[PDB]
Amino acid sequence: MRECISIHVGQAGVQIGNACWELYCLEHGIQPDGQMPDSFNTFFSETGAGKHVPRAVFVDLEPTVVDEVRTGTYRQLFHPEQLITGKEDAANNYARGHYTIGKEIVDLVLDRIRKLADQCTGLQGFLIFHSFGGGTGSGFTSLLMERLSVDYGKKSKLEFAIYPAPQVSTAVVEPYNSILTTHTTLEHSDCAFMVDNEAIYDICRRNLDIERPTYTNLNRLIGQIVSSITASLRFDGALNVDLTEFQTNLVPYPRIHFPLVTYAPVISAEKAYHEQLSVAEITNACFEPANQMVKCDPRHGKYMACCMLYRGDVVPKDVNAAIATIKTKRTIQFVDWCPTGFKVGINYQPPTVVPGGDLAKVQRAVCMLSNTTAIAEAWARLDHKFDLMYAKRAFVHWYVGEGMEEGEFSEAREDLAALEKDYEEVG
Amino acid sequence: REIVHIQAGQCGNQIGAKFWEIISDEHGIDATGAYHGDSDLQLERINVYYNEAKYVPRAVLVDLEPGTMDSVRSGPFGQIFRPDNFVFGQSGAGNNWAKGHYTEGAELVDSVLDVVRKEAESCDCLQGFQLTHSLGGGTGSGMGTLLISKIREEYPDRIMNTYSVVPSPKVSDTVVEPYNATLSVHQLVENTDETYCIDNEALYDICFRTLKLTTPTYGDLNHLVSLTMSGVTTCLRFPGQLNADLRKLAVNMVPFPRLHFFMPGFAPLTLTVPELTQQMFDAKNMMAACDPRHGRYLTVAAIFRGRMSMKEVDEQMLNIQNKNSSYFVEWIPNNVKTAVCDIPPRGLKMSATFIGNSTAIQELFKRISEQFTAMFRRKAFLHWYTGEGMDEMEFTEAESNMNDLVSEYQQYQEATA
Numbered sequence A: 001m002r003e004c005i006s007i008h009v010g011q012a013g014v015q016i017g018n019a020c021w022e023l024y025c026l027e028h029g030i031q032p033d034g035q036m037p038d039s040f041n042t043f044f045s046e047t048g049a050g051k052h053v054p055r056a057v058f059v060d061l062e063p064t065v066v067d068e069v070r071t072g073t074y075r076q077l078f079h080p081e082q083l084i085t086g087k088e089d090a091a092n093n094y095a096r097g098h099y100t101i102g103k104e105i106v107d108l109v110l111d112r113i114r115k116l117a118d119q120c121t122g123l124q125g126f127l128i129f130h131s132f133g134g135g136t137g138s139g140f141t142s143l144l145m146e147r148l149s150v151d152y153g154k155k156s157k158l159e160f161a162i163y164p165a166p167q168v169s170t171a172v173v174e175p176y177n178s179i180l181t182t183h184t185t186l187e188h189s190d191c192a193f194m195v196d197n198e199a200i201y202d203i204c205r206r207n208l209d210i211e212r213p214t215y216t217n218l219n220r221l222i223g224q225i226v227s228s229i230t231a232s233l234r235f236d237g238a239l240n241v242d243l244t245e246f247q248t249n250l251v252p253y254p255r256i257h258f259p260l261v262t263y264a265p266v267i268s269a270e271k272a273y274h275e276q277l278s279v280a281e282i283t284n285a286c287f288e289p290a291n292q293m294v295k296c297d298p299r300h301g302k303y304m305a306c307c308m309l310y311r312g313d314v315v316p317k318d319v320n321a322a323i324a325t326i327k328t329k330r331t332i333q334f335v336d337w338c339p340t341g342f343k344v345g346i347n348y349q350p351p352t353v354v355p356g357g358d359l360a361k362v363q364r365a366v367c368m369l370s371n372t373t374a375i376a377e378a379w380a381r382l383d384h385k386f387d388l389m390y391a392k393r394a395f396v397h398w399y400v401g402e403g404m405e406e407g408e409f410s411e412a413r414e415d416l417a418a419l420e421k422d423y424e425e426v427g
Numbered sequence B: 001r002e003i004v005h006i007q008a009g010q011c012g013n014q015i016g017a018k019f020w021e022i023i024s025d026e027h028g029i030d031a032t033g034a035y036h037g038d039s040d041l042q043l044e045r046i047n048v049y050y051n052e053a054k055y056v057p058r059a060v061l062v063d064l065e066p067g068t069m070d071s072v073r074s075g076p077f078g079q080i081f082r083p084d085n086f087v088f089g090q091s092g093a094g095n096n097w098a099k100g101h102y103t104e105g106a107e108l109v110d111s112v113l114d115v116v117r118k119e120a121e122s123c124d125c126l127q128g129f130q131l132t133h134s135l136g137g138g139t140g141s142g143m144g145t146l147l148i149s150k151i152r153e154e155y156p157d158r159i160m161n162t163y164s165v166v167p168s169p170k171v172s173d174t175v176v177e178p179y180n181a182t183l184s185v186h187q188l189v190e191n192t193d194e195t196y197c198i199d200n201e202a203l204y205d206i207c208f209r210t211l212k213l214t215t216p217t218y219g220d221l222n223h224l225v226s227l228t229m230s231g232v233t234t235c236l237r238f239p240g241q242l243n244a245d246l247r248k249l250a251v252n253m254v255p256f257p258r259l260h261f262f263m264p265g266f267a268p269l270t271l272t273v274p275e276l277t278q279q280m281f282d283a284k285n286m287m288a289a290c291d292p293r294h295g296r297y298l299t300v301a302a303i304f305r306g307r308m309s310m311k312e313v314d315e316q317m318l319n320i321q322n323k324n325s326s327y328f329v330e331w332i333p334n335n336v337k338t339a340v341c342d343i344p345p346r347g348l349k350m351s352a353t354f355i356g357n358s359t360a361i362q363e364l365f366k367r368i369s370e371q372f373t374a375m376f377r378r379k380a381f382l383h384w385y386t387g388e389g390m391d392e393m394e395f396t397e398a399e400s401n402m403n404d405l406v407s408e409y410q411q412y413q414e415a416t417a
């Protein structure tokens, strides 16, 4: 029919996946054991016993977080052969994850996806969750991308990558792995939803008033945005029906496949007495730079495409009024040769949050996917850090001692340098 | 995952025994090996340094001089160690590197390597080894280097952490040691991935200038060394995200291989957070004798222990990085890493630990360099080694490599973006 596979790599990917699948089950009413008391069948496969199991592959080169999954309250929801561990990790090194450690485990991983796919008939592709600062989350993600493209060349693929941020950063070599994984992955992906940890951290500090947001809050919010993105795939919507329609509507050119994602509104649970924010107010909040998942200035860049995804008790006429109000502005600058409209898909299922988190349920909400040239600067900062290290050949021996050639770094840098040019080319 | 502890020589055995006693007190394991603490956090990562069968340390104890058996067996933790793991020779080395490296180390090295093999094959996954030894003597230094070389050629893919103490005249005032120190630093540069360069001069200075003591014996010095060892391994022993294991620690802290010598620091010395943050960077709190403001740090790991607010420590670490931004190299973005753990060390409520790869360490080697220049150019005690299967060429090449290391540290100190 229409089926999707979820792939989770590394610690960040696995924890985001925990949050996302927990929220999916809470939204669809699936009990933690998997027994449901179907348009959503795209993300869950049912068995003879009525047991709905996710099509999720939890991958890690070290077993700590996967074991955390196996001892959690969702232990019986996932199948034991769908969760893959290892005895040695990459130690924050893209070279170890991609070249050394990844060889011993990629075959088993691909076999597991093969068994998952033989239960599928209408696969559109994979939704890969991973990060940029990790050795596993970059190296094995890249190798899996390459092997899947070799194996599923017709099929589509998406990322939900995590942009490194200093406050929660763990390694000093994060720009190295980010540049390496981007250079190798740019060819085998259709649409990447980068998320900046500094943006989420700031939202939790400001909107949610959390003094020290730990990883739990970050993954909960990221699950909210990811679920809001995939609702069209899971709730039988009128737009973005399959994974190909994403890249058709948001990625008009091969290289530039990096949309900017915005979620509104964000209200702390302790502010439960909040009055319901109107459609106009949240529509305005969409374009406020203080509520974006990647830190950049869309005001200072030129758009390429844009789409709205509403949720809740939302009436189309008020949506059209808000769109008309926003359109007659000088702050929105599309290019001079492309459809200067908003592909507005409207959903009516109410927004629902995790019972227990610091977010409060809001009767209506909205997400905004805008492919623009602003996010370009979000790349440049990374390159800056890269330019500060490879010039002195700092830390390069750790990579070269695990099966990587030194000049590759330069190539990778050059690639994103070229990427940057494309951003000014369209702008 | 597991770490196979190794200690050699009198100093190595003493500091290792102190390390084991302190971490056993922290982890709630009694002197008989059983657990009697009252936290879940203590057992989350207890397999790293212990074996369950009661908990048994994963240690091998080596000393050519055979008396130190009973001393080790007379400590508060003398019966927990595996009796086979004691690998002691018959005769002492007499503070000669060549004696412990060519004529008498070469006999007991086989048995100690076999014991190491037996300990390593019992682990599902191994991070690496930690050698607590001494660079001034002839048993710790020469034997330590020989075992490091043998293990590195036998386990090419294991991280070889070590702890080394550089001797000072203010502690012993013996004259032959700098030859052993130079010959050992040669192997440490060549065949090691990270090193916590402890200085006896620094410990004497802290004990005298600060603690207001006559600073006798090895009790207080080993107490301070034990505290620092507990602080530095706090991240590996307890659950956390910064430097979860030895390889992640080395990747985080060591750029430019052969430049992996670290300046430890601990506080308080035996109370609000801001004074902890100010003191832990201060020159009065370095176990390697130098001024950290005389050099530029390349990498820094700061570990806080106790109950404290995270926002305050983050603010103060940001403030320190901002104020002293002259001393932090600008070509390593975000080179200061920060970890906070809940369990304080035994007897202390609020504690701070610092590990810094800094260029200031260069002046330490220069110091040792001059001491070597004070004797090698005078042909002092040369035949003591030439009669033991040693050649002057090794002395010359060790001097050259140490001088090249000094030059490297100076070059990376002077470099700019």
Ligand SMILES: Nc1nc2c(ncn2[C@@H]2O[C@H](COP(=O)(O)OP(=O)(O)OP(=O)(O)O)[C@@H](O)[C@H]2O)c(=O)[nH]1
Pocket (backbone or CB within 6 Å): A009, A010, A011, A012, A013, A015, A016, A061, A062, A089, A090, A091, A092, A093, A097, A130, A131, A132, A133, A134, A135, A136, A137, A162, A164, A165, A168, A169, A170, A171, A197, A215, A216, A218, A219, A222
């Ligand atoms: N959203 C989110 N990001 C995280 C989380 N944990 C870590 N990160 C980010 O991920 C980065 C590290 O990447 P990881 O994927 O965790 O690295 P890894 O999977 O352990 O790969 P190896 O280190 O080689 O084992 C860190 O710098 C964090 O910024 C999390 O729980 N949620």
Ligand SMILES: Nc1nc2c(ncn2[C@@H]2O[C@H](COP(=O)(O)OP(=O)(O)OP(=O)(O)O)[C@@H](O)[C@H]2O)c(=O)[nH]1
Pocket (backbone or CB within 6 Å): B008, B009, B010, B011, B012, B014, B015, B064, B065, B092, B093, B094, B095, B096, B134, B135, B136, B137, B138, B139, B140, B141, B165, B167, B168, B171, B172, B173, B200, B203, B218, B221, B222
């Ligand atoms: N701080 C401190 N230093 C020590 C201790 N034990 C030995 N040392 C130092 O070690 C030096 C003596 O040489 P060692 O390295 O101990 O040699 P050894 O371990 O006794 O073995 P041999 O070389 O055979 O004598 C002295 O200068 C001391 O400063 C100790 O317990 N604490």
Ligand SMILES: [Mg+2]
Pocket (backbone or CB within 6 Å): A010, A011, A062, A089, A136
């Ligand atoms: Mg990991």
